[PDB]
């Protein structure tokens, strides 16, 4: 029955977003680094894997195999609008992720060998979808097991015009359709029908087989093999900025944040003396926050610095940029326990009236939303960089930074100092699943993780 099936759909987005897709993205947003003690995570950190690798097979199968099944039997199930509509909003972020990674995805051949679909056809089908399960709506309630939203319609309805906003972002960007899409996020924006709270999971307990899935794997069928990204360190310690503490310990040889620089972990060890580079030199990602912490789909935050960045680039109104921009420092500030404490980098580094141009305050946004998404969704971290280029790319390369820290720009991404990838750069995509390579001749061929997905043109 569609109330037993609908609470996996969420279920086995939140297993892949929230966990393995996570895990991977926070890499390629350069949050965290691979502990110089272990080796679990080298071939992310370092670019690497390959397609063989499989990094991405699990969550492939859970959200096909799983998520996007259990949606086409709640909508085979139920006749409700409502829980249609709820449906329909999960059936199109589960192929957000997916394009997001691999660009091409299944989509109207998906649910034998179906052909991959290119993303922009998948985004413009599931906008679509959402369109019209929405005009669908009756005003009678839901009935399925909502998690998610305790069968707020609103809610949904918020929810839907948040995703609106992140994917009519990326056609802008990659110049589809931009003027036609600018005016429909205008509108949006105007409209302010988004949701209240945070998009999350949150049932998560410490108890077995209960446990965040990014805890899960991390820090009980593994050994913890994060330690804080150079970056993202830099970033924090020079805005001065208390969120330093959350997720992110002291090291244990000198109570100092320490960020490792991505893919640097073997150069460190070859350079200082593999003694001299122990997980005690380097930040630790604190776990300790971990195993109830919910999945994210989408953060007020994000969608504040979504807002903001509407109507600095598209309205040109400076006031209502700086609410929303503010609004979301004040909402990531609240979710990490610093509740009242946003001052700190709103009238210091990050001041909004610091900025002056356009470029200044959209840095602001871009970086901020970056923080925001730490240790909350990683995998739409590394969408808004791709998307956004901001963080921007360092000009100097790790080893450069290494001899010399002051080249650096604090915050600006590195290029992973070992990088698998033959052209160099960030990484740009994953793979495509091992298991679709092997079960269907219509999965694209593979292509370096240099190649970025459709939406990805600068
Ligand atoms: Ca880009």
């Not at 015009?161 to 972002?169: D, E, S, V």
């Not at 356009?358 to 590394?382: G, P, R, T």
């Not at 995509?429 to 079960?439: D, F, G, K, V």
Request: aromatic content about 12%.
């Amino acid at each position: 029955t569609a109330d037993l099936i609908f609470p996996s759909i969420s279920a086995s987005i939140a297993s892949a977003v929230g966990g393995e897709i996570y895990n991977y993205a926070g890499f390629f947003a350069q949050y965290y680094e691979q502990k110089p003690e272990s080796n679990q995570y080298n071939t992310l950190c370092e670019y690497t894997f390959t397609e063989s690798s499989q990094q991405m097979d699990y969550s492939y199968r859970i959200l096909f195999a799983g998520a996007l099944e259990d949606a086409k039997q709640v909508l085979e199930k139920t006749t409700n609008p409502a829980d249609r509509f709820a449906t329909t909003i999960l059936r199109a972020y589960a192929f957000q992720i997916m394009v997001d990674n691999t660009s091409d995805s299944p989509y109207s051949e998906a649910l034998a060998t179906p052909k991959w679909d290119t993303g922009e056809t998948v985004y413009k089908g599931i906008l679509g979808e959402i369109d019209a399960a929405e005009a669908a709506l009756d005003g009678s309630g839901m009935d399925v097991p909502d998690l998610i939203f305790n069968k707020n319609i609103a809610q949904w309805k918020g929810f839907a015009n948040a995703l609106r906003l992140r994917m009519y972002l990326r056609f802008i960007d990659a110049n589809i359709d931009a003027a036609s899409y600018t005016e429909k996020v205008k509108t949006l924006v105007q409209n302010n029908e988004f949701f209240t709270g945070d998009v999350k999971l949150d049932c998560f307990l410490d108890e077995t087989d209960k446990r965040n899935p990014w805890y899960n794997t991390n820090a009980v069928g593994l050994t913890g093999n994060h330690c804080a990204a150079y970056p993202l360190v830099s970033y924090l310690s020079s805005t001065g900025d208390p969120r330093i503490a959350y997720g992110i310990s002291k090291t244990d040889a000198d109570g100092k944040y320490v960020g490792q620089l991505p893919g640097g972990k073997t150069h460190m060890q070859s350079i200082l003396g593999t003694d001299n580079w122990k997980n005690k030199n380097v930040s630790a990602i604190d776990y300790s926050i971990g195993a109830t912490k919910p999945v994210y789909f989408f953060t007020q935050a994000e969608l504040q610095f979504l807002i903001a960045e509407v109507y600095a680039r598209f309205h040109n109104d400076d006031a209502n940029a700086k609410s929303a921009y503010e609004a979301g420092v004040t909402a990531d500030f609240a979710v990490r326990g610093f509740a009242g404490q946003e001052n700190t980098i709103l009238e210091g580094a990050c001041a909004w009236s610091a900025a002056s141009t356009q470029a200044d305050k959209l840095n602001l946004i871009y970086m901020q939303k970056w923080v925001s998404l730490f240790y909350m969704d990683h995998m739409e971290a590394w969408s808004e960089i791709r998307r956004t280029d901001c963080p921007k790319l360092s000009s100097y390369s790790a080893a450069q930074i290494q001899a010399s820290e002051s080249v650096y720009t604090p915050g600006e991404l590195v290029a992973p100092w070992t990088n698998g990838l033959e052209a160099g750069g960030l990484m740009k995509r994953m793979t495509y699943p091992l298991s679709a390579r092997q079960q269907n001749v219509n999965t694209p061929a593979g292509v370096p993780g240099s190649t970025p997905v459709w939406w990805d043109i600068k």
